[PDB]
Design an enzyme around this catalytic site. Structure first.
Site, PDB file in Angstrom:
ATOM      1  N   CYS A 130       0.787  -1.316   0.003  1.00 52.47           N
ATOM      2  CA  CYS A 130      -0.087   0.045  -0.002  1.00 52.47           C
ATOM      3  C   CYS A 130       0.862   1.317  -0.013  1.00 52.47           C
ATOM      4  O   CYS A 130       1.784   1.349   0.904  1.00 52.47           O
ATOM      5  CB  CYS A 130      -0.854  -0.011   1.204  1.00 52.47           C
ATOM      6  N   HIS A 173      -8.996  -4.122  -3.883  1.00 47.90           N
ATOM      7  CA  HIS A 173      -8.173  -3.085  -3.031  1.00 47.90           C
ATOM      8  C   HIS A 173      -8.786  -1.808  -3.179  1.00 47.90           C
ATOM      9  O   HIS A 173      -8.790  -1.266  -2.014  1.00 47.90           O
ATOM     10  CB  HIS A 173      -6.754  -3.397  -3.458  1.00 47.90           C
ATOM     11  N   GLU A 174      -8.695  -1.221  -4.264  1.00 51.43           N
ATOM     12  CA  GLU A 174      -9.036   0.284  -4.435  1.00 51.43           C
ATOM     13  C   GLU A 174     -10.640   0.547  -3.812  1.00 51.43           C
ATOM     14  O   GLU A 174     -10.772   1.446  -3.103  1.00 51.43           O
ATOM     15  CB  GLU A 174      -9.065   0.772  -5.742  1.00 51.43           C
ATOM     16  N   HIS A 177     -10.560   0.938  -0.297  1.00 53.57           N
ATOM     17  CA  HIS A 177      -9.991   2.223   0.358  1.00 53.57           C
ATOM     18  C   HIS A 177     -11.207   3.225   0.384  1.00 53.57           C
ATOM     19  O   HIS A 177     -11.333   3.803   1.226  1.00 53.57           O
ATOM     20  CB  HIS A 177      -9.126   2.798  -0.791  1.00 53.57           C
TER      21      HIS A 177
HETATM   22 ZN   LIG Z   1      -3.988   0.854  -1.376  1.00 47.74          ZN
END
Ligand SMILES: [Zn+2]
Ligand SMILES: O=C(C[C@@H](CC1CCCC1)c1nc(Cc2ccc3c(c2)OCO3)no1)NO
Ligand SMILES: [Zn+2]
Ligand SMILES: [Zn+2]
Ligand SMILES: [Zn+2]
Ligand SMILES: [Zn+2]
Ligand SMILES: [Zn+2]
Ligand SMILES: [Zn+2]
Ligand SMILES: [Zn+2]
Ligand SMILES: [Zn+2]
Length: 203
Positions: A130, A173-174, A177
């Site tokens: 990250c 993953h995004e 966020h």
């Molecule tokens: Zn990330």
């Protein structure tokens, strides 16, 4: 505000714009964007895509001091909006020939979400990293193997898309966020390398 710094015409996103682990913005649920997009939101998307392009460009990455990257979410720039950029490159063959498609996925996605997914789980063999995390974090980040996503592009056009492999991992993953979820949230608490039978480990 952070947004004003980022959308300045001559401003290029670099690591100094990326907030770090501990910053509360990384844990919020990002706000949906409304269409038509404001100039700021449109510009921000373009800047984020440009960041990914630069991070993958040997010269620009060196000029700007950039960690190579395949995705970026607005919360990582301290902007709590549902905006992500994804840029997943295809690889050259053994002979050095460029791939027929430069990318397996290239998109700035507004209001993205997972609408369905496989029962099967998957994880990168090498774990995940990250941009906002300056620690070595070992272990399988257990995600959905395959997903169906919906999102809007900068025009407000709706897209419905099925994804698998690395593309699926990157988008998940995004999307995390923008929901205030960090990759290590999805690593086994007691044994980072525990493998539940049927887990697809992507090399
Ligand atoms: Zn990330
Ligand atoms: O933190 C990041 C950068 C991660 C993205 C991902 C890590 C795993 C999947 C996507 C990156 N690492 C290498 N390229 O990009 N994006 O939010
Ligand atoms: Zn900057
Ligand atoms: Zn709202
Ligand atoms: Zn534009
Ligand atoms: Zn450039
Ligand atoms: Zn093509
Ligand atoms: Zn589900
Ligand atoms: Zn899910
Ligand atoms: Zn933990």
């Amino acid at each position: 505000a952070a947004i004003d710094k980022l959308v300045k015409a001559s401003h290029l996103i670099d690591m100094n714009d990326i907030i770090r682990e501990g910053n509360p913005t990384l844990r919020k649920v990002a706000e949906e964007v409304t269409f038509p997009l404001s100039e700021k939101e449109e510009i921000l998307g373009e800047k984020m895509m440009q960041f990914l392009k630069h991070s993958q460009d040997p010269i620009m990455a060196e000029k700007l001091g950039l960690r190579g990257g395949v995705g970026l979410a607005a919360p990582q720039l301290d902007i709590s909006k549902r905006i992500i950029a994804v840029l997943v490159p295809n690889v050259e063959d053994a002979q050095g020939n460029p791939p027929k498609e430069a990318y397996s996925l290239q998109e700035v996605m507004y209001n993205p979400k997972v609408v369905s997914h496989s029962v099967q789980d998957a994880a990168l063999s090498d774990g995940e990293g990250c941009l906002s995390v300056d620690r070595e974090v070992p272990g399988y980040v257990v995600r959905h193997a395959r997903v169906t996503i919906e999102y809007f592009d900068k025009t407000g056009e709706k897209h419905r898309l099925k994804l698998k492999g690395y593309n699926s991992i990157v988008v998940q993953h995004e999307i995390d966020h923008i929901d205030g979820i960090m990759f290590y949230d999805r690593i086994n608490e007691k044994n980072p390398f525990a493998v539940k039978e049927g887990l697809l480990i992507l090399e």
